[PDB]
Structures are given as structure tokens and as C-alpha cells.
Amino acid sequence: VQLVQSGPGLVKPSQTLALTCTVSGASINSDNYYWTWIRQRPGGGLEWIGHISYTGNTYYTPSLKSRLSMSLETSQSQFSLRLTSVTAADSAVYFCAACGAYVLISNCGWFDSWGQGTQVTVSSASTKGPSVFPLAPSSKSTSGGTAALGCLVKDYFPEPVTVSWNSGALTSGVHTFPAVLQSSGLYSLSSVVTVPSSSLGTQTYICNVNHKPSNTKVDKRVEPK
Amino acid sequence: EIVMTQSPSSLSASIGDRVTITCQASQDISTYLNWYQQKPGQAPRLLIYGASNLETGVPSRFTGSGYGTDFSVTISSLQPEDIATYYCQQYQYLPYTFAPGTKVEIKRTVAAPSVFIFPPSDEQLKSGTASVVCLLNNFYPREAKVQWKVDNALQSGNSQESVTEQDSKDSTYSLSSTLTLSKADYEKHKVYACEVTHQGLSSPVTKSFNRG
Amino acid sequence: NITEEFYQSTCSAVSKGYLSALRTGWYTSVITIELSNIKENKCDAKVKLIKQELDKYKNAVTELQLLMQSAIASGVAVCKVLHLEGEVNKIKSALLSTNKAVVSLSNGVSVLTFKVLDLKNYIDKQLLPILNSCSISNIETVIEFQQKNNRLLEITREFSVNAGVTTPVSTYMLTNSELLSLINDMPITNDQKKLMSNNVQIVRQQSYSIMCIIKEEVLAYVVQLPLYGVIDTPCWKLHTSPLCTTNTKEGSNICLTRTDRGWYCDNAGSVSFFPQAETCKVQSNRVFCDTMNSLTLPSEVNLCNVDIFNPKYDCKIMTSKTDVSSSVITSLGAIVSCYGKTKCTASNKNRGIIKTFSNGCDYVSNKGVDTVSVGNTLYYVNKQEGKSLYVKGEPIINFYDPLVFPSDEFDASISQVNEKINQSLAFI
């Protein structure tokens, strides 16, 4: 079973959060399948939200019962989640998941299938595309044979940002750091590659930034001096 | 709601070691306990279902044990591809609950960080701010200390660090410290330095530049 | 050991020499079959057969799940406790390392629990490692699963066609060895344990299997077993037949029949009377009955056999003028009520007719008699060994004046009949 999540990364407070998960490999109405939703608060453990059965029966966690809604859309082979009156305490990565069994005599609690997850941020702030600045290599960033360089992805909102080097051709020695929340409301992260110093001046290094929450894709050439 | 206790909170072990994480539930949950493995940036992965059964595609070195209130998961020989966080979860009673987790780090010999410092780009200086980045690359253990000296003046409260998760290839870490100044403040001073203290360095190391 | 007395005076017969075994209470055990959860099934002639059994297993589980959407009041109460959350888990923990365990339920009832079949252990060590290489080249693994699953299918069938309550308790519900050891662990005397073990077929007939719950891979049904709290007291069976006058003119005859026929057993200084037949089962000279369908009578009720006009107990009779012929086959002979023009005889297999009955109520023993014929109805007699005693006496119907005899009393007695006779005589 393959699971693909669709949902917004930014949601204004006291609104309703709408997520859908598209199932491949088994019918939404197949026997003993329970479509589960799980959320993971930042830097924390997992929290089981609830599930909806192949027949349509739903169980919501007692904490969120008043604000939760789940439904089946068999024609599009997908199930959905709705959380209303959201606040900043509901910002998390929301995981579509599925439990299925050939013979089931207990609760279906093993989640062998998962979706990639949706990073949901709940804030009254507006999305902003990042500003990308090069970290040029010099003598202060050369240690023997290899030299370091990178780019600085600064002042964006909300998470996350996708960073590539040379469209994906450069992958060894790449270190993209976890983002940091600055003193303002915005984020910032850095990506760095270590490279044979002899190659500077003869090979092109370009930093590929992709920020989907604002339809932003930025390419910046990183060059010596 | 059922409380789940996982022990230890985090552990480090050499490659090939025997690693065991235990799990305890507030009350008896029979055989209805799962084990999950989650690496950074990815969804969890089911390792053990029904206390002891091994999920298809999981290496043989994962073993599940226990019944009732006390359970455990065991890695027969720890490997680089196992650097992750491990969760146990119960499903006898609704709502299903997870444990806080257990971080797993690989232990290796002490490696000194390669220190690099980057001045602000002229493109950023037009915008009005200036960021100086100092990079500590491929060191172990994780504990490291970085502090900035703008004209031999210790800075405080304008720097932010970020650490990578442990690289499975060489079991090291990397760190990035970013000193943020305004263009006006940045052009009033000349020397910018980061002073790195680490266990793999006999004496603190300093990387600095001029023309600020 | 079995003896019988026929009373000519009242056209009745008492068979005695029987020993009591009266069900006074109920013992409830919880019988469990540990089931299992099957994550996936994905895959060759031998393995194809295994998959057919897996389908029978899955279908059986589904049927039992669909299934879950006074004599057994106690068993039903135990089933209700099993539906509370955590309750099944208590049993699961008790039976983790043993098949027999006593478990106190949440309502304080301490029940004996019995794991009679462990299908969970079998599939998770043998089959589950194999269902995710698909290559099973020996016949003995196939056989064990077919044997073990066949029982589950039949138990499921029984509950499915009995609305979750079965009787007698089959050997699928509880094998002979399982039942015998359950009896051994019961809180009863050695005499009680011995009686039940020597009559396991009767114990099954007086037991109930009550389908309770399938939850958390445990299928559990309650087997409700009889407790025989009264043993080795005397029992006797009263047989009765119509006693009529034999005047020549048709329709001028009057009849009398002792009512309350049935089994009687001494019990705690009184006599237990079981009016509805079939509630007692007779094996040899031991008689198993059920006390919920009995009356408790003064022990003076016995006087109706020796002296039906005694002033201390009002013997029950019915009256009519319907002098039809019939026979009652007793334990050790046959009562023949022969009236009008009916030819009534008793014959032996090889010798032929050996007694021809005259008009009246009469009796013949089973010694040398195989059949009795009254009119066109042939009766085979019981051929069990035992001595009979014929107690001669004038038929009491001759003591009544036919001109004042009440022939329209069904539920009646000597005193009631006397009272009514007194009223008709007063007006004359």
C-alpha cells in the first residue's frame, strides 16, 4: 500500500485544517483496513489522532473529539481529516497511516504503511520566500586539499525548505543543517559542500533552493573570491 | 489513557554492539505492542508488531520480547544504518499511545572539527544586514563550543547554532554558527573570529578574517 | 436391585430401588480457544491446500464475529462480565503459562478457566515464518493444522445453528479427557466426582455450552455443568392406569385414575416430585433429575400407595366414564386396563400367548413375557432383571355408588370427590 498526502503547510489560527490521503494498492473499502491519522509535534513524540474504518466507523482521540472529523471518499480512493478551531498548539507534521490485516481479532494498531507527512504550521504570519546568499570559498575555508563552500537560505516562512546542489548531481560531502528560528518570526538555514580545492574555477557550483509554501525556486551561483 | 515509559532516553554504542531498549506500560497490554524506527525527515518504520513478530523486510538482528507490562527490543549487532529514534506503541486500548522515544547514537573515536569561517556576501550587504558563518565540520563527539570575537569583544545573543544529525557514513557531526549584524555595525569593526573549543583539540582553535 | 410392587386396589405400580442424583446447582467454567491474528497471506500443490485451510479459518472467525451482533441465567451472567474492557486480558494473563487456572472476575465471581486449544502458538512459530518462502514440502505440518482447525469449524457451526447456546455439550466443545479433568478439579466430594465420571454421557446431556465473546484473539464460551447436591437417596417411579367398573351395559361404567404419576425422590426430609417427564435420565439404577421442575411434598405422600384413603394426605385422582382400554409399560412389567370387548393378552416370543386378561385392571411381570397386546396396539415390555410383587386388593372404584359419582373431575382428590358425593346424596 502506497500513501500520498495532500494538504496546506500554512493555516491561519481559529480555522479548519483539511488534509487528504490518496491510497494506492488496496481499495478504501477492502477488508479490515483502518485509515489512521498521527501527528508529531516539533521535537516531540507521536500522538495518535484517530482512525476511520473501511465501513466508515470513526474513533477520535478523546482530547480532539469535539474538533475532529474524518470521512471516506471511495470514488477517489482517499480519506480525509478535519480539525477545527486550530491554534498554534496544533502545528505538527501530520502523518497519514494505514493498518490492514487478513484475519483481525484485535485492534488494528500496527502501521506498516505511512505517508511522507505534511508539515502544518499554524500562525497568523504570511508566507515569505527566502533570500539566498552565497558563502564563497577562500583561504579561510581551505584546509589542505579540500575547500568548503555553501549558500545561506535566510528569512523565510514557514518550514520547510528543500536545498539541492547542481540539480542533484552533487551529493557527496553535502551537509544541509536544520533550520533555526531567528529573533524575528522567520527561519534560516545553511547548506555546505566540501569540494577538492583544485576544482574551483573549473567547475560550477550552484545552490538550488525550493520553498513550496510560497512557490519559490531560487538558483544562486557560488564562486571563489 | 495509557502511559508508556521507554528506557533509556538515549544511548550510544559501538558498531556491532548489542543494544537493548526496554518499554513499560502503565497497565497490562498483553502482546499488543509495536516498535517503530524513525530517521530524520522520514516517516516512522514498523519494526516489530505484536510484541515479537518481525515485519517483512526488517533485518534479522531485530528481536522483540515481553508480554503484559514489560517489553524490550534488541539489536543483535548495531549498524550505521540504525542511527535513528525508536518508539514503542500500544494498541490494546483505544486511544493508541506512543512512548517518548529513545535516541540511538553510534560511538566512535574522537575526531577534531575542520573549522571554516565565511565573511558576508556583498549581495547581502546591500539588503542592510550581514551574516558571518563559522563551520565546524566532521567532529565527534557532539559536544562543542563556539564563541565570537568582533575586534576581541565577546559577542552574546546575536549568534545561532545548528547541528546536523549523526552522519551514518563516518558517525561524525557538523555544526554551523551564524553571527548576525547590521551593515552599519559590521563596517565599524575590522576583525571577526570564532573560537572553537572541542575535546579533540589540544588548545582552542581560532579562524578570523579582516576588512569588515 | 430394582424392585416393583403393583397395587391391584388402585391400578398403579411403584418401581423402587433407584438411587438419586439430583441437580441442585450449577458450576460455570470458562473454556477458551486461543486464536490468532494473521497480518498477511501472499504466495505448489501442498501450499495451495494450506491456503484452503486458512480460508476456512478466516471464514470461521468472521462467522463467529457476526454471531455476536432460567437454566442458563448463571452462565449468561458470566458472559456479560467477559465483555467489560480488560476482562479478557485478565484471562489471557492467567492462562499464559498453564491451561488450567482459577480467575476472579471484576464482580468477585471466581471462575475456573480452561485453554482447550492453542491455535495462536501454532501459527506464529510454524506458519508465519513461512507465509511471507512459500515452499512447504512435508505433509505433517499440513495435517496438524487441518486437525486443529477442523475443531474450530465445528464449534463455530454448533454455535451458529444454536443461537450461541448448545445442549448436549458435544465432544468438540469439551473432549472426554478435558471433561474428566474438569470434573476432577470441581469443588465436590469424591462420591460426586466418581458419579459424574462413570456417567459422562448424562453429564453432557444436562450441561450447556454458552457462546460468550470473541475479542483480542480469544474465543471463550462458558460450559455450565450440573452440580448434584443430593446423592444416594431412594427414588421411585409411580405408574398409573385407568381403573373402571365392568358392568355389561355400555356407558354405565365409571372410572378412576391416580394422577401425579412420575418420579419421586427422597430429599432433605421431604419428597421431590418431578411432574414433567424427560427431565430425569435413568442409567442403571441411578436416576439424574433437575430440581427446578419439581415440587417439594411431605413425606406422607407415600401413604397413597399403601393406603389411598388415609386421612393424613389427600391423594390426587381424576374421574371419568370413558372406559377405554390401554396398557402402561413399567420398569419390570406391564399394567393392562382391559375393558369392553377388547381382546387383551400377553405373549412370549417363542411360546406365544401365555396370559389372557379378563376385564379389569391387571398386571404381568417381564419374566417370560416379551410383548403385550391390547386391541391392535402391540407393546414391547422392558426386559431388565428385577423382582416384582403383586399386591392383591379389591379395586376401589367398586366402593363408589355410580349414581352420585362425579365423572367430570380432572384435577381432583378423594376429599374433593367425597365432598361432591356428599352434596349429591344430600339432595336425594
Numbering used by the authors:
A (entry chain B): 2 to 35, 35A, 35B, 36 to 82, 82A, 82B, 82C, 83 to 100, ...
B (entry chain C): 1 to 212
C (entry chain A): 27 to 69, 73 to 98, 146 to 208, 211 to 506
Cite, word for word, the article reporting this structure.
RSV F is a class I fusion protein that mediates fusion of the viral membrane with a host-cell membrane, a process that poses an otherwise insurmountable energetic barrier to viral entry. Initially, the F protein exists in a metastable prefusion conformation that is anchored in the viral membrane by a transmembrane domain. We find that antibody CR9501 favors the opening of soluble, prefusion F trimers and exhibits distinct competition profiles on trimeric and monomeric prefusion F proteins. We utilize the unique properties of CR9501 to demonstrate that the prefusion RSV F trimer is in a monomer–trimer equilibrium when expressed on the surface of mammalian cells. These findings suggest that prefusion RSV F trimers are dynamic molecules capable of transiently opening and dissociating, a discovery that has implications for the structure and function of class I fusion proteins as well as RSV vaccine development.
To avoid conformational heterogeneity resulting from CR9501-induced opening of prefusion F trimers, we sought to determine a CR9501-bound F structure by using the monomeric variant of prefusion F. This complex formed crystals in space group P212121 that diffracted X-rays to 3.3 Å resolution. The structure revealed that CR9501 recognizes antigenic site V, but also makes substantial contacts with the F2 subunit, consistent with the results of shotgun mutagenesis. The third heavy chain complementarity-determining region (CDR H3) of CR9501 is inserted between two elements of the F2 subunit—the α1 helix and the loop that connects this helix to β2. CR9501 uses both the heavy and light chain CDRs to contact five discrete regions of the linear RSV F protein sequence that are in close proximity in the prefusion F conformation. The light chain interacts with four of these regions, forming a salt bridge with Lys65 and a hydrogen bond with Glu66, both of which are on the loop connecting β2 and α1 in the F2 subunit. The disulfide-stabilized CDR H3 forms hydrogen bonds with Asn63 and Asp84 and a salt bridge with Lys65. A rigid-body motion between the trimer apex and the membrane-proximal region of the protein was present in the monomeric structure. Comparing the rigid-body movements identified in the CR9501-bound monomer to those of the two prefusion F states identified above revealed that the conformation of the CR9501-bound monomer most closely resembles that of the State 2 trimer. The α1 and α5 helices are tilted away from the apex of the neighboring protomer, although to a lesser degree than what was observed for trimeric proteins, resulting in loss of inter-protomeric contacts between α1 and α5 and orientation of Ile217 outward to expose the central cavity. Consistent with the subtle differences between the CR9501-bound monomer and the trimeric prefusion F structures, CR9501 displayed high-affinity binding for both trimeric and monomeric prefusion F.
